[PDB]
């Protein structure tokens, strides 16, 4: 937690202090997106490399762990530049200009690394529901509890918090929040 | 006048003209004191320009100051509100009172942009900090304007301390919405 | 008067009031004459110094005007004249467009006997020539194009008794932005319209009859208000259109 | 000795006295297009005159005929003329039909009606302009005070000297006068350096002027290495003089950084991959012969030995692995010696502006040259081409402003494409043995093939010639014969023919170092053109480039074989 | 800038045959009205001048179309194509309006 705070601070300073010529582009994009109810942000990697190479190196080697920190930095900046709060966690969308890797050149050497590739969509599935905020209650002592989940790959506790059974907990489906998931096939 | 709209709203360049028609303070680098060709202006008092002594404080109109700084014969002193301390005081005042506008001069945005463009060397504080503070103020003022737009009616509105550029960029929407509301109310009488 | 700065201030306030107002404001006859005379004299002045500097140069291959205390004054004369000419040009063209918009209304005003408004005061002489010529040209165009093939019952371009009134009049309830200057010069006690309010500076009072309400305008505040209820204050310089 | 290095200031004052005015424009600058040093010097002069509020006009001209036509239309109100990039070699008064007695309006010497300044670096000087004319004045840099000691005596004393001793002396002095001529032409200095000297004398030096000076000096690296090696230490000193301070706390969006960092003789390293930089380099190609399969195999073996995976060396420089980029210097130092490529390591100048990215001087000059080359009944056909070449000057001019970076990126892409095309043509030239080795010179005529429409521009043909000369210099064959390169244009049915001087190997010792090999193609071309009624066009500023009709090529060259001086 | 429009040189914005004959006549008298306005009491002010405020004393301009030498008050401009000028804004307003110059 003593490194995550500094990481979030670095991301927030990147969002708030990046300037080209005479306009804060990433500060203006957030405000323009909030007005039309777009809760997301698009960042070009070349700007991030230009601002500070250590920040880029941190992201390039641990994406699943670092990306949620940038996710919460964005929504911390948004609540400052929009509100003096029904704002969900924002989304980060990335743009890259690196070399494209063919599908058949992807192997065990490329695990847990960000890649860029091209192909043909052949099928699109239906939308499914994934939980983000879970309201939880115990079967015996019956007290309220909450859980927060990020989709960057969790289970209900295998215990009891305050005899109750091994892992007694049920989900209160009302007052729980969900998002949209889709599966695609490439070629 | 007629072309390119201009019927009932000012363009940003005309607002800049009005802003540059306002006085400012300078430190002359030349001495034009009369001995013991003259300016003879027709729209501005030339007494200060005729009687100039080096390394002393005088005040003239803004555009003459810009013309002089185009050469190496002037140095414009930025107003006292263009400081980090005085901007942080206004930011705090802006935060504490969420239902009134802070008291800033009616040309703060235009003057800030012009001074940043022309007289970059004259500022004492680093210019990037001031540029960030200006954006910080503008965002909060925009939030307050967005909240205040909800109270539109047919009778009258009061915008006590709104700036010139902020009024100009919002006039066509506000006037037309209230005009349509007034016609709808009048029809039913 | 007898102050060249106040002439420029008055011209600027007249231009600013002209652009944002719906009606056709009265013409400041004296101010325009003084400004045109000043421009005419000033142009002659710069021409005189320019000629004097040029003539001596060619006589005996003398040095040009020595750069110090020479170029900047004359450059300032030129740019100042350029700005003033632009301001007057914009004012004149805006009022000419407004004249174009309200030709029939002005004609009806001039033709009415019991009308205190007269074109000799509200319109300049050149504007009178413009109005007369443009009206005749437009009438010739419409008569040659369309109106000749029409029954004698309806052949008039101005008909106040038809299904739709053909004479357009200025919008007297347009919403405008105003700033409360207060007394034009001072002596706050002298002004009878000023009335004090609780723990505040004196404020003007106006009435909206259609809404039937009383609205107080405090000095130093910007308002969005109807144009009719504020005509007298603007005419007496108590308020300024922004 | 008209205007010495120290005297450069006073001439400026004259331009401030005669030309400056708030009611008239009386200064005209004629600048040689298709040249980078002249363009940078004109930019510096334009900024200087803009600061002091002097109205000016810049007119890019292509050839001597254009200058002669434009001089007549020029009025007498224009008191000052500045000829940048040309005019030193030829006699200006005879060329422009200038009568000294006609130009005297300020009777007294003669102050004269108009003043013409010449700012050129192509030696040898014309003795008439240096020693005999008063309307024409030149910005000399120290050639006359040392080299031309006896020439001044000969010229003045022959002018004044005009019973057997007279006949003897006049002949043995006209001998010296003709000995001064009949010499080849080279370049010994840069215009931007002289303009920077003027700036330092006046006192208006800053970072932008230093960047422009570096840009002007860098362009001479490929053709005249000696001048660059002479001028480099002073550039290093001026860079250290103008450093802002020590301990820069943080990088802010307004910082500017001019740093001396180690760079390499590689083509566009920071805007392409490492493999591409090694592939499209003149020096690497000369040292390894990449046009055939053996060179490519050797390059693959080198990359394998160095420890860089072939997949990683083909990635973009920004997205290349950080660990490899950090240790590139050690890897170069310890491996480059085996393959003879140890000469690729050097130091240069790198400029950075905020959160944008770093650019080196070499990449900047290649982008500018690419913008010059491509951008945007036969007399009209040539006129349109020359008009487009004039038009490209403003495209290259705009790229020097910090606001227009998209044009710089476009120039980088154009440079990459142009170098690819040059390589593709060069491999075809080298594989089919199109180069013919005659006794006096080596001939290469391109009559058939794709994309011959790129070689109608002199700069592209100079690119291909620089490729071929670099390839021949490192060849084990020891010779210094000049080369002739000819290219056909079907639309005009004309060959464009250029003569190119030989060059010593880049890494060779300084024992042979001297004033570089002199270009003798101008005198030979003039000698052949005068004697025969050949349909040739010698009108470019560079006297080594001519346009000859298709029918006359084969006989003309034969005459050149017997001409000599080559 | 006033002028007789189609009879004299026009900026090629409009073809002759689009307008009706009565419209062509109307345009002629309207242009004459503009002309005898411009000679009224407001001679010094150019009622057909530019309507953007002046805020730059010295500007850089580029020539679009080739032309000959043109005299201006106290000097001469030589309009060689593909050449750049650094001169006061007031001198070149007319030439920019007529398409012989670019930029401001
Ligand atoms: Zn429990």
PDB file of N, CA and C in Angstrom, chain A residues 17-21 45-46 49-51 56-57 96-99, chain D residues 251 253-254 311 314-316 318-319 322 354-357 402-403:
ATOM      1  N   UNK A  17      -0.775  17.368 -15.257  1.00  0.00           N
ATOM      2  CA  UNK A  17       0.337  18.245 -15.590  1.00  0.00           C
ATOM      3  C   UNK A  17       0.873  18.071 -17.003  1.00  0.00           C
ATOM      4  N   UNK A  18       0.331  17.149 -17.791  1.00  0.00           N
ATOM      5  CA  UNK A  18       0.771  16.993 -19.169  1.00  0.00           C
ATOM      6  C   UNK A  18       0.227  18.134 -20.018  1.00  0.00           C
ATOM      7  N   UNK A  19       1.107  18.759 -20.794  1.00  0.00           N
ATOM      8  CA  UNK A  19       0.726  19.872 -21.648  1.00  0.00           C
ATOM      9  C   UNK A  19       1.560  19.838 -22.916  1.00  0.00           C
ATOM     10  N   UNK A  20       0.911  20.109 -24.043  1.00  0.00           N
ATOM     11  CA  UNK A  20       1.583  20.326 -25.319  1.00  0.00           C
ATOM     12  C   UNK A  20       1.125  21.683 -25.834  1.00  0.00           C
ATOM     13  N   UNK A  21       2.085  22.573 -26.085  1.00  0.00           N
ATOM     14  CA  UNK A  21       1.808  23.941 -26.508  1.00  0.00           C
ATOM     15  C   UNK A  21       1.084  24.701 -25.405  1.00  0.00           C
ATOM     16  N   UNK A  45       0.455   5.941 -25.848  1.00  0.00           N
ATOM     17  CA  UNK A  45       1.634   5.497 -25.111  1.00  0.00           C
ATOM     18  C   UNK A  45       2.851   6.369 -25.390  1.00  0.00           C
ATOM     19  N   UNK A  46       2.922   6.997 -26.565  1.00  0.00           N
ATOM     20  CA  UNK A  46       4.058   7.861 -26.863  1.00  0.00           C
ATOM     21  C   UNK A  46       4.121   9.047 -25.913  1.00  0.00           C
ATOM     22  N   UNK A  49       5.505   7.759 -22.615  1.00  0.00           N
ATOM     23  CA  UNK A  49       6.953   7.575 -22.689  1.00  0.00           C
ATOM     24  C   UNK A  49       7.664   8.920 -22.629  1.00  0.00           C
ATOM     25  N   UNK A  50       7.131   9.923 -23.328  1.00  0.00           N
ATOM     26  CA  UNK A  50       7.753  11.236 -23.307  1.00  0.00           C
ATOM     27  C   UNK A  50       7.722  11.886 -21.936  1.00  0.00           C
ATOM     28  N   UNK A  51       6.620  11.709 -21.204  1.00  0.00           N
ATOM     29  CA  UNK A  51       6.493  12.338 -19.892  1.00  0.00           C
ATOM     30  C   UNK A  51       7.493  11.761 -18.898  1.00  0.00           C
ATOM     31  N   UNK A  56       6.246   4.336 -17.707  1.00  0.00           N
ATOM     32  CA  UNK A  56       5.999   3.388 -18.788  1.00  0.00           C
ATOM     33  C   UNK A  56       6.590   2.021 -18.475  1.00  0.00           C
ATOM     34  N   UNK A  57       7.795   1.992 -17.899  1.00  0.00           N
ATOM     35  CA  UNK A  57       8.428   0.720 -17.567  1.00  0.00           C
ATOM     36  C   UNK A  57       7.647  -0.034 -16.500  1.00  0.00           C
ATOM     37  N   UNK A  96      -1.304   2.031 -29.377  1.00  0.00           N
ATOM     38  CA  UNK A  96       0.093   1.658 -29.519  1.00  0.00           C
ATOM     39  C   UNK A  96       0.484   1.696 -30.986  1.00  0.00           C
ATOM     40  N   UNK A  97       1.772   1.951 -31.222  1.00  0.00           N
ATOM     41  CA  UNK A  97       2.344   1.965 -32.562  1.00  0.00           C
ATOM     42  C   UNK A  97       3.491   0.973 -32.698  1.00  0.00           C
ATOM     43  N   UNK A  98       3.567  -0.010 -31.807  1.00  0.00           N
ATOM     44  CA  UNK A  98       4.628  -1.001 -31.869  1.00  0.00           C
ATOM     45  C   UNK A  98       4.384  -1.982 -33.012  1.00  0.00           C
ATOM     46  N   UNK A  99       5.391  -2.813 -33.273  1.00  0.00           N
ATOM     47  CA  UNK A  99       5.291  -3.798 -34.339  1.00  0.00           C
ATOM     48  C   UNK A  99       4.183  -4.801 -34.046  1.00  0.00           C
TER      49      UNK A  99
ATOM     50  N   UNK D 251      11.646  18.292 -15.244  1.00  0.00           N
ATOM     51  CA  UNK D 251      11.314  18.533 -16.640  1.00  0.00           C
ATOM     52  C   UNK D 251       9.928  19.157 -16.742  1.00  0.00           C
ATOM     53  N   UNK D 253       7.069  21.453 -19.284  1.00  0.00           N
ATOM     54  CA  UNK D 253       6.729  21.475 -20.717  1.00  0.00           C
ATOM     55  C   UNK D 253       7.379  22.603 -21.500  1.00  0.00           C
ATOM     56  N   UNK D 254       8.131  23.490 -20.852  1.00  0.00           N
ATOM     57  CA  UNK D 254       8.734  24.628 -21.528  1.00  0.00           C
ATOM     58  C   UNK D 254      10.256  24.583 -21.543  1.00  0.00           C
ATOM     59  N   UNK D 311      14.602 -10.464 -33.512  1.00  0.00           N
ATOM     60  CA  UNK D 311      13.253  -9.932 -33.354  1.00  0.00           C
ATOM     61  C   UNK D 311      13.262  -8.577 -32.659  1.00  0.00           C
ATOM     62  N   UNK D 314      14.434  -5.353 -34.722  1.00  0.00           N
ATOM     63  CA  UNK D 314      13.514  -4.884 -35.749  1.00  0.00           C
ATOM     64  C   UNK D 314      12.337  -4.105 -35.178  1.00  0.00           C
ATOM     65  N   UNK D 315      12.342  -3.820 -33.880  1.00  0.00           N
ATOM     66  CA  UNK D 315      11.283  -3.036 -33.265  1.00  0.00           C
ATOM     67  C   UNK D 315      11.592  -1.546 -33.363  1.00  0.00           C
ATOM     68  N   UNK D 316      10.559  -0.738 -33.142  1.00  0.00           N
ATOM     69  CA  UNK D 316      10.713   0.708 -33.157  1.00  0.00           C
ATOM     70  C   UNK D 316      11.590   1.151 -31.988  1.00  0.00           C
ATOM     71  N   UNK D 318      11.410   3.681 -29.922  1.00  0.00           N
ATOM     72  CA  UNK D 318      10.701   4.015 -28.689  1.00  0.00           C
ATOM     73  C   UNK D 318      10.305   2.764 -27.917  1.00  0.00           C
ATOM     74  N   UNK D 319       9.854   1.727 -28.622  1.00  0.00           N
ATOM     75  CA  UNK D 319       9.355   0.515 -27.992  1.00  0.00           C
ATOM     76  C   UNK D 319      10.419  -0.573 -27.894  1.00  0.00           C
ATOM     77  N   UNK D 322      14.307  -1.694 -22.939  1.00  0.00           N
ATOM     78  CA  UNK D 322      15.045  -0.681 -22.191  1.00  0.00           C
ATOM     79  C   UNK D 322      16.447  -1.160 -21.831  1.00  0.00           C
ATOM     80  N   UNK D 354      10.462  19.809 -24.127  1.00  0.00           N
ATOM     81  CA  UNK D 354       9.326  19.356 -23.340  1.00  0.00           C
ATOM     82  C   UNK D 354       9.089  17.865 -23.468  1.00  0.00           C
ATOM     83  N   UNK D 355       7.824  17.470 -23.350  1.00  0.00           N
ATOM     84  CA  UNK D 355       7.436  16.062 -23.432  1.00  0.00           C
ATOM     85  C   UNK D 355       7.151  15.667 -24.882  1.00  0.00           C
ATOM     86  N   UNK D 356       8.135  15.902 -25.749  1.00  0.00           N
ATOM     87  CA  UNK D 356       7.945  15.689 -27.180  1.00  0.00           C
ATOM     88  C   UNK D 356       8.819  14.567 -27.722  1.00  0.00           C
ATOM     89  N   UNK D 357      10.117  14.608 -27.492  1.00  0.00           N
ATOM     90  CA  UNK D 357      11.027  13.626 -28.044  1.00  0.00           C
ATOM     91  C   UNK D 357      12.288  14.293 -28.550  1.00  0.00           C
ATOM     92  N   UNK D 402       9.087  25.837 -34.793  1.00  0.00           N
ATOM     93  CA  UNK D 402       8.760  24.824 -33.795  1.00  0.00           C
ATOM     94  C   UNK D 402       7.284  24.453 -33.834  1.00  0.00           C
ATOM     95  N   UNK D 403       6.442  25.335 -34.375  1.00  0.00           N
ATOM     96  CA  UNK D 403       5.008  25.070 -34.391  1.00  0.00           C
ATOM     97  C   UNK D 403       4.650  23.977 -35.391  1.00  0.00           C
TER      98      UNK D 403
END
